[PDB]
């Protein structure tokens, strides 16, 4: 109805406080996930206050009507929040409780350069926009965060659910404005990717590597360029579920790497079958047997060099 | 209106029961359901007592407003359900009957490790928060607990539809609050498994050992590279439909295993070429006669140990 | 407001009708369809009688408020009915006529035994709920009931709508219900599956048999496997459409049959090429003309056999 | 509040117009379309006639309310349109102007037997229902129909959009009803399927045809199997950007007549070869000349005779 | 309630301003993204003017109701937004600050003639229609127009977000209407593309391009043909993200030139084993050598000429 009157100069502190009960569809396309949890307000106003010896009882319950409450938004959500207020005390000195349950679809940008085994960290961002007459800020309750003992999300592991206690005063719009800063800390199960992804392209390598131990032309081109089908629907399989990235990956550099040994082997036997035209078996035959060793050193080390690079 | 008045500590007591009519649209992927059933409540309210003989009837009927209504929520759900109120009477003890019907989607965690052939249990959660004049506790009321016999879940038989009679009662948010749980037992059909995978599987199988009865190089190369191009379409199609799991499920242990299997007969056939060109000629048909035996054994074996460690 | 009281104990009489205007969107996998209808009812409430002659008028226009309206609900829908009053008349007697638009999805299982050639029949179930001190029962009005000529489902072809007159009275928690059905009966277009899908695959069936006027392995094998795996896409391609089935439908049957036909042959050409090794060619001779013939006279009786089977 | 008072027992005529502004989201699946555009309303009310001297006005203004405006509503739309008045005024003598805008999705069967080069008619009707103290019928303002500029359709040229002057008054449950149909016209641009979908198939077809200038028969064989099954991967985006409404069609007698070709050719190379084993070499080289004019001039000739058919 | 009355003949002048937060879902199929903004306004309204010194405060707050509030509406949106007022100011002159916050979603068309290295401009329009005793125009406040530094769209580059100063005034259905123009200007993000579809392209296209130093028509022939299968898919997997195009585009161009270098391999492969049959294998090597050298310069050279051309 109205904001409470400053006594002299002070402004009104509200501290606050979420409880996550679940958190579930995370995207990876859309990098957006839904919430659902607990919302804890706390202020001071001294117009409700009352003689608990005259009034007989201790705690006051309101209604959402005929009482004073601040306007607390969310930033970074695609639509407002779907709540509905459980309940609101008032203690006799004036301090007013309020608890709302909510659930919204959240906005956050997530990182992939080390995609099959990376580690995100989810933004909640809480605004409050002060009025003519009051200036409004916010505050941290540490014994109103936490979450719920059964929240999961479908591949990821979650480790902990903090906020950062310092608020950030700024001015939008000509007027002044708080804001928090929740964060959510996960990680990625990377050991079903391994025996799903990583092993097969492997075994697929080396049946298409198996052709230097050969003398004939069309079997290696058969060989060569089937695994390279195999190798194009496995790269579309893989890079079908993940957004365009705007730098470099791993998976990328991966890929990529995988088509030029690809390319290299073609030239190989090309080269060897050219030479053996031309009556020249002894150059073929020292050429495809530095190509058996050549190949998995290079394969190795090429691997060794890009996780030390992305990874240290 | 307002919480009925105890007598001097007694808890108030609301009995509860769901009573299913359609649940539908389980997805693997999301791990959610939707359902649609009533929901009866019954307490006692001294307020509204009266005698039967004076006013002449034996159940009076009241509008939602004007008479206080314990709120009751789902946990898991994405959204609040939404719901209308059928029928409110009223005894002449005071005892009230409520019903509802209400639709909503439940979020459910899944278990893919027997996926072919797994069971399920589907759970509902019912929670009360207590207000501070009074502690409200739930109960159980078996006889109106059950499911439409036209209930149709697309590939799936229903077993039960039980509750479990004690509730779990702790403190969140410094208050006391009651939970039940709602617990739907469901069991695959795995016969249209067979024909659609595993039988076409075992058939490209059995197509690609055909190449032990072969000594052209070519053809042999063309049948393996062929039937693994196959393998790879199949295995695509089937994990359209599985989401991720963080642990060792069945199906992944097969394919998994199947890729092995075509690397060794890979690197059979290319043995074979290679002492038969080496002018010796005996030491390849020793290991094509072997292999001939050894391969199916092994498979047979393997898959057995599989079965037994999966299931047992 | 309040039910009308009965003489001694007639139950009240509302006749329905539902007139249809628009049917679309006939999902397969999730089992589903979209109406959009009209909605009769008329019942008696001698409460709202007039006399004509000092009214001056004949029929009295109530809003949908002040006026006692029954409550009818649908059975298997997904969420209520999105309905809007039209018109409400009052007889001088006090008949009322009632009037409405609606649209809802409805929920009805499917069949598909005989999936490219099989006839379906929708159902939509209206139910009313008896109040405490009135019974209430449905009947049908016949000259309300039918559907629109411009009608219009995707590869569908309408055939009737009507309703069953006696409706099933039972007693659901602790209250008498009276259930109408409504049907709807629908047959497929079946003509478009011809060119698109079954000839094609009969033309590659042949192609694979082509592969018994040759003795060349390299080629016979590269016809049998390129051909199969040419099966393979028409046969996800088909897959892709119906949903997952309890029992053996007509299209499995065929699938399994022609895997099983790609199958024997890779062993007769297996067995022919064997024989050939060894030196003894008048065997496979006989053999591959014995096959020529053996192969499409039995793909014929066994598709005689199957056609028999699930069309009678 | 009332329908204006009957005037020598003559229907009440009303006049219409919609100016479009937004036309999007064509989906030709569900054959709907979603729309955004006003609504002009016209008609007499004795009552509201007003002196203009006296009160010293030009024009009056009335709330939506304590005004009586006749219901009209679309008979092919998914749900009630989203309407919001903007202005209603009435001139100095009894006409009343009525303005609004709305947004809806409609719906409107699509034919698609020249799918590539076709056009369509998408249709818009309103209806109004007689009351029981009065009748009324529509009428089209000239002036009131039009299209904004900016109207744009992802792959559509718009052509015009006019309405039929003559109503159809028509007894429906008892009440008579009056339709105006409103038409706009479009055309699909055919230009970028050309060198997206037609030439590709006529290369690839080439390239299995070049296998009449060669004798050797695995080269034959893979060169035609080869191109059938990259007809088929082509055909798989084909039947991914195309409309997945099931029908006869042009694109489908093109690619039934492709498949036709293949199985052709397959059999002349099988013929081929057989007869150049039963060395009768001059039987081959006869049929492989003639059939090397013989393909491209049927093949000219069936395309002829099917454009000519279904566009003419 | 009413508007503001003018002095003599000024009409009403509103300014404007939109301050962005947060925009995302940028659909290039469907040509719509999502916005989430502030909006500002200012009027003048001598009706509500007063005297700090008699009222003893500076600033007076209002709700929504019980004043009069310009309707502005934006043009290319699919719905109406969804608005909530934050403040509502009255300075002592008249001068009132009106601030909303809302989310919409945008139709803006797409230019696709250069889709990889491509840049679009995005359009918001605002429109106020004049009332029948005021003219009303909109104007553009420089101070209240920006965007926050936390925007982001993925995989584009946000340039700036400007307005034009002058409205476009013109008369609608007999009313005067204002109309802004709110553009933003974004660039795409070009690198990603490289690695992952041109030079996978290119070694492809090599690979092919290898078989000029053979002599062998069987593996000429599995090279070219494998490597049109591989082509496709890769085009494909292009075209998944990509809507019809009315007018040719760069990528279009270059997919065909491919196709038409493919079909040229085959007839000079064909070519050079018919040479040979006929016993000149003089013509054959010339032919041969002279495509080495020929393929490589004229597709270098029809590349530049393309880049040319669509990027002069
Ligand atoms: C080759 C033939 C044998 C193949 C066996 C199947 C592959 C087994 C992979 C096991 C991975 C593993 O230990 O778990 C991954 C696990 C992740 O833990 P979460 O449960 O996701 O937390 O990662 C680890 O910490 C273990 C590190 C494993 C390294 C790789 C092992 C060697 C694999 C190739 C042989
Ligand atoms: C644009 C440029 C790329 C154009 C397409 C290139 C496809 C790959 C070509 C393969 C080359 C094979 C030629 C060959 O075998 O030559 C052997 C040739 C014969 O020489 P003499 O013994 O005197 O006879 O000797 C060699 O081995 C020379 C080295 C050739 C292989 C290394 C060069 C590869 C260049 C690829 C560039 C791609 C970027
Ligand atoms: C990682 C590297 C991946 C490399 C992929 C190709 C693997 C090798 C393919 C098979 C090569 C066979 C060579 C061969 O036959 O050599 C003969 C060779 C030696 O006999 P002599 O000539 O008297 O000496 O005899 C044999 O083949 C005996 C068996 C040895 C090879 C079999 C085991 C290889 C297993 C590789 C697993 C890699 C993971
Ligand atoms: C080879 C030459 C034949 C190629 C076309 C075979 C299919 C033609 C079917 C046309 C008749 C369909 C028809 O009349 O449908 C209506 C009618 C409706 O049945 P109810 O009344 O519900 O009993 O359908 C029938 O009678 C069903 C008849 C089933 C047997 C014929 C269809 C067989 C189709 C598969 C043939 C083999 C395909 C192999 C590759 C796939
Ligand atoms: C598990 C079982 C399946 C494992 C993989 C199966 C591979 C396919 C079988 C290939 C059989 C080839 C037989 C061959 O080449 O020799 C023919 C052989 C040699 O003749 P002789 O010298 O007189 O002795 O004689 C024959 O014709 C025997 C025919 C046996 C094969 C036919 C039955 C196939 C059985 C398939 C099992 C699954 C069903
Ligand atoms: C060799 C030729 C290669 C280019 C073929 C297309 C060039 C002609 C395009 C012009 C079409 C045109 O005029 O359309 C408008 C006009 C509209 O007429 P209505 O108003 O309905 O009377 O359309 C027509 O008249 C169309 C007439 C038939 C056009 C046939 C075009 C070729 C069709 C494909 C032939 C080859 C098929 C190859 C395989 C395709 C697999 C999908
Ligand atoms: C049941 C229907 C499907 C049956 C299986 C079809 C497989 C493909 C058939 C291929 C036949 C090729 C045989 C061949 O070339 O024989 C040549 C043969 C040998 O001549 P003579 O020395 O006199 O003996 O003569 C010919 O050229 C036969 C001419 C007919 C062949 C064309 C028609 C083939 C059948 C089409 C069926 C379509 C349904
Ligand atoms: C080896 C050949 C080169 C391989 C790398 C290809 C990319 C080279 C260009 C990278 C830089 C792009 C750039 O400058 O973009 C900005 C700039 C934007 O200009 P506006 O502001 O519109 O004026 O873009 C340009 O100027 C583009 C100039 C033409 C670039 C041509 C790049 C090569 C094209 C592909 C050739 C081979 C095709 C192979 C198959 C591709 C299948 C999709
Ligand atoms: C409808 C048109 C499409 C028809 C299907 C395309 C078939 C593919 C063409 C293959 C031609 C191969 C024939 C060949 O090499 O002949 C060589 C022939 C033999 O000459 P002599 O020794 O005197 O006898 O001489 C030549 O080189 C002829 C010229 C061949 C190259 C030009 C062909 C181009 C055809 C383009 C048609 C499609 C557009
Ligand atoms: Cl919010
Ligand atoms: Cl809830
Ligand atoms: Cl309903
Ligand atoms: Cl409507
Ligand atoms: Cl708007």
């Not at 109205?2 to 990876?28: F, H, K, Q």
């Not at 202020?43 to 009034?55: C, E, Y």
Request: net charge negative.
């Amino acid at each position: 109805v109205s904001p409470p009157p400053p006594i002299a100069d002070e402004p009104l502190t509200v501290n606050t406080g979420i409880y996550l009960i679940e958190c579930y569809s995370l995207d990876d396309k859309a990098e957006t996930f839904k919430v659902n949890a607990f919302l804890s307000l706390s202020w001071k106003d001294r117009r409700l206050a009352f003689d608990p010896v005259r009034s007989g009882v201790r705690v006051k319950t309101y209604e959402p009507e005929a009482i004073w409450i601040p306007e607390i938004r969310f930033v970074n959500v695609e639509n407002a929040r779907d709540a509905d207020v459980v309940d609101i005390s008032v203690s006799p000195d004036g301090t007013v409780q309020y608890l709302e349950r909510f659930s919204a679809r959240v906005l956050s940008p997530l990182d992939f350069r080390r995609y099959p085994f990376d580690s995100q960290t989810l933004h909640i961002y809480l605004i409050v926009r002060s009025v003519d007459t009051r200036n409004i800020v916010l505050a941290v309750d540490l014994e109103k965060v936490g979450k719920n003992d059964d929240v999961f999300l479908t591949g990821w592991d979650i480790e902990s659910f903090t906020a950062v206690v310092k608020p950030a005063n700024f001015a939008l719009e000509d007027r002044l404005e708080s804001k928090l800063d929740y964060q959510l800390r996960i990680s990625r199960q990377y050991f079903s990717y391994i025996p799903n992804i990583i092993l097969p392209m492997l075994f697929i390598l080396f049946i298409s590597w198996t052709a230097f131990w050969s003398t004939s032309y069309e079997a290696n081109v058969t060989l060569v360029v089937s695994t390279l089908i195999a190798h194009i629907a496995f790269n579309i399989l893989v890079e079908t579920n993940l957004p365009k990235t705007p730098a470099m990956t791993y998976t990328g550099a991966i890929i990529f790497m995988i088509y030029l040994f690809y390319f290299v082997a073609v030239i190989e036997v090309t080269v060897q079958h050219y030479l053996k035209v031309e009556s020249q078996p002894a150059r073929a035959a020292s050429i495809t047997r530095a190509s058996r060793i050549a190949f998995p050193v290079v394969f190795l080390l090429a691997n060794i060099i890009l996780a030390f690079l992305f990874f240290g």
